Enzyme design. Sequence first.
Site, PDB file in Angstrom:
ATOM      1  N   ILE A  76      17.243  -9.659 -35.352  1.00 35.55           N
ATOM      2  CA  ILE A  76      18.611  -9.338 -35.706  1.00 35.55           C
ATOM      3  C   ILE A  76      19.432  -9.356 -34.431  1.00 35.55           C
ATOM      4  O   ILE A  76      20.403 -10.100 -34.308  1.00 35.55           O
ATOM      5  CB  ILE A  76      18.718  -7.910 -36.292  1.00 35.55           C
ATOM      6  N   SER A 125      20.271  -9.608 -30.396  1.00 40.21           N
ATOM      7  CA  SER A 125      20.045 -10.742 -29.505  1.00 40.21           C
ATOM      8  C   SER A 125      20.439 -10.415 -28.070  1.00 40.21           C
ATOM      9  O   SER A 125      21.369  -9.638 -27.835  1.00 40.21           O
ATOM     10  CB  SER A 125      20.846 -11.950 -30.023  1.00 40.21           C
ATOM     11  N   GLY A 126      19.694 -10.984 -27.121  1.00 39.27           N
ATOM     12  CA  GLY A 126      20.078 -11.000 -25.706  1.00 39.27           C
ATOM     13  C   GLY A 126      20.188  -9.659 -24.991  1.00 39.27           C
ATOM     14  O   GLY A 126      20.379  -8.610 -25.615  1.00 39.27           O
ATOM     15  N   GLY A 127      20.105  -9.718 -23.662  1.00 40.15           N
ATOM     16  CA  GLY A 127      20.132  -8.536 -22.810  1.00 40.15           C
ATOM     17  C   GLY A 127      18.709  -8.068 -22.630  1.00 40.15           C
ATOM     18  O   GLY A 127      17.769  -8.714 -23.114  1.00 40.15           O
ATOM     19  N   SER A 128      18.541  -6.937 -21.949  1.00 41.97           N
ATOM     20  CA  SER A 128      17.228  -6.291 -21.861  1.00 41.97           C
ATOM     21  C   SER A 128      16.809  -5.662 -23.213  1.00 41.97           C
ATOM     22  O   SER A 128      15.695  -5.139 -23.342  1.00 41.97           O
ATOM     23  CB  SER A 128      17.215  -5.241 -20.734  1.00 41.97           C
ATOM     24  N   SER A 129      17.699  -5.750 -24.209  1.00 40.06           N
ATOM     25  CA  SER A 129      17.521  -5.125 -25.511  1.00 40.06           C
ATOM     26  C   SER A 129      17.498  -6.158 -26.650  1.00 40.06           C
ATOM     27  O   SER A 129      18.338  -7.049 -26.701  1.00 40.06           O
ATOM     28  CB  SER A 129      18.662  -4.142 -25.738  1.00 40.06           C
ATOM     29  N   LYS A 130      16.529  -6.026 -27.555  1.00 37.88           N
ATOM     30  CA  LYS A 130      16.449  -6.847 -28.766  1.00 37.88           C
ATOM     31  C   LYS A 130      16.219  -5.957 -29.995  1.00 37.88           C
ATOM     32  O   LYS A 130      15.602  -4.899 -29.890  1.00 37.88           O
ATOM     33  CB  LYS A 130      15.311  -7.866 -28.643  1.00 37.88           C
ATOM     34  N   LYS A 155      14.281  -1.452 -32.474  1.00 33.37           N
ATOM     35  CA  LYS A 155      15.008  -1.722 -31.242  1.00 33.37           C
ATOM     36  C   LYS A 155      14.017  -1.711 -30.083  1.00 33.37           C
ATOM     37  O   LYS A 155      13.253  -0.757 -29.913  1.00 33.37           O
ATOM     38  CB  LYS A 155      16.121  -0.702 -31.010  1.00 33.37           C
ATOM     39  N   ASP A 159      34.188   3.986 -27.488  1.00 33.93           N
ATOM     40  CA  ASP A 159      34.096   2.529 -27.599  1.00 33.93           C
ATOM     41  C   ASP A 159      33.874   2.108 -29.054  1.00 33.93           C
ATOM     42  O   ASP A 159      33.107   1.190 -29.322  1.00 33.93           O
ATOM     43  CB  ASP A 159      32.926   2.028 -26.727  1.00 33.93           C
TER      44      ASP A 159
HETATM   45 CL1  LIG Z   1      19.756  -0.410 -34.741  1.00 32.27          CL
HETATM   46  C1  LIG Z   1      20.255  -1.601 -35.879  1.00 32.27           C
HETATM   47  C2  LIG Z   1      19.681  -1.671 -37.151  1.00 32.27           C
HETATM   48  C3  LIG Z   1      20.102  -2.663 -38.040  1.00 32.27           C
HETATM   49  C4  LIG Z   1      21.097  -3.573 -37.659  1.00 32.27           C
HETATM   50  C5  LIG Z   1      21.563  -4.578 -38.516  1.00 32.27           C
HETATM   51  N1  LIG Z   1      21.067  -4.735 -39.748  1.00 32.27           N
HETATM   52  C6  LIG Z   1      21.509  -5.816 -40.638  1.00 32.27           C
HETATM   53  C7  LIG Z   1      20.635  -7.049 -40.401  1.00 32.27           C
HETATM   54  C8  LIG Z   1      20.452  -7.946 -41.627  1.00 32.27           C
HETATM   55  C9  LIG Z   1      19.299  -7.055 -41.146  1.00 32.27           C
HETATM   56  N2  LIG Z   1      22.526  -5.407 -38.071  1.00 32.27           N
HETATM   57  C10 LIG Z   1      23.035  -5.289 -36.850  1.00 32.27           C
HETATM   58  N3  LIG Z   1      22.628  -4.354 -36.011  1.00 32.27           N
HETATM   59  C11 LIG Z   1      21.669  -3.490 -36.382  1.00 32.27           C
HETATM   60  C12 LIG Z   1      21.244  -2.505 -35.496  1.00 32.27           C
END
Ligand SMILES: Clc1ccc2c(NCC3CC3)ncnc2c1
Length: 258
Positions: free
Chosen positions: A16, A18-23, A38, A132
């Site tokens: 879901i 994308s990108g950064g040190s986080s996915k 996460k 923010d």
């Molecule tokens: Cl922590 C978190 C959890 C669910 C997210 C989400 N869900 C919708 C995507 C279709 C599955 N969409 C965008 N960001 C999200 C961030």
Amino acid sequence: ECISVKGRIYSILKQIGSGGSSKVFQVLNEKKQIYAIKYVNLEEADNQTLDSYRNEIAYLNKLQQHSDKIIRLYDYEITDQYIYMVMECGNIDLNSWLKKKKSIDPWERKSYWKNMLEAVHTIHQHGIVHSDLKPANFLIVDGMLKLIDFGIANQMSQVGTVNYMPPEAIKDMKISPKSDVWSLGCILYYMTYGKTPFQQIINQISKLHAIIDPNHEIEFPDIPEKDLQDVLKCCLKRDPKQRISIPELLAHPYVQIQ
Ligand SMILES: Clc1ccc2c(NCC3CC3)ncnc2c1
């Protein structure tokens, strides 16, 4: 492809986030229950960054029990090298939904607004000002909006709008709970009139100048819901002192009547 978190194995359906040190990944537990995981890579994170991450996790964990308009944190694993957070998946984030939406049902818009007020009120009650807020911070889950984060995390090229930024933040170069009211106001204004208040201004420097300029009057075209129109005017007052509060918003006829 799979991830383990506190012993439990999760199979990945897709990415879901994308990108950064986080996915962020869409995943299933062994019983095929759906979740979002996460993932944060901590290898290049200094202590201040690390501290902001631990602080947001701690708050998310605590405030969960205080409103169901805050995203669910089921579990997490945290080491020196990574964080895995097992969270509520939901259906779609508010921004992506608003982008594919022709127009919004007045009932749905009022319902989303109520959810947003409830989530933000909750964080304010515990000393957190998000500072923010945008549509992307809200997740639609079973026709309920949930706040995805608290804006505590430190840090992670033509992205990062100033469209929701309050004037006192720009003049401050103080932030208070009223700052969140402005940004909420810009979200509702977008759900009402199909654009944010200063979206027309091309140049970002100019945009920031319009936001702080008393002589720059925000337009509020007449609409059937007069109560909605009044909410917008109350939220988008440049002087935080005269700007409406969340408790006042919760007693507002727009959310209370009919
Ligand atoms: Cl922590 C978190 C959890 C669910 C997210 C989400 N869900 C919708 C995507 C279709 C599955 N969409 C965008 N960001 C999200 C961030």
